[PDB]
């Protein structure tokens, strides 16, 4: 099988309100997530190397 959520990790009952970043590993509630969204977007936009696209 190739399923997920099948490995040992910490236990909590609030992982649905929190948000996590697949490239940063930090967890934010909601108002502090705005600072992550701007900075993580700026880095991901700036990280543009070996690019090639034409018609």
Residues that bind Zn ion (CB under 5 A): 21, 23-24, 40
Q: Could you tell me which residues come within 8 angstroms of residue 40 by beta carbon, excluding any fewer than 6 positions away?
A: 21, 23, 24
Q: Could you tell me which residues come within 8 angstroms of residue 12 by beta carbon, excluding any fewer than 6 positions away?
A: none
Closest distance to Zn ion from the beta carbon of 52 (Å): 25
Tokens of 31: 């108002």
Closer to Zn ion by Cβ: residue 24 or 32: 24
Closest distance to Zn ion from the beta carbon of 44 (Å): 8
Closest distance to Zn ion from the beta carbon of 26 (Å): 7
């Amino acid at each position: 099988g190739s399923e997920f959520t099948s490995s040992p990790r910490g236990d909590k009952a609030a992982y649905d309100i929190l948000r996590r970043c697949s490239q940063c590993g930090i967890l934010l509630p909601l108002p502090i997530l705005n600072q992550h969204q701007e900075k993580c977007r700026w880095l991901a936009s700036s990280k543009g190397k070996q690019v090639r696209n034409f018609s």
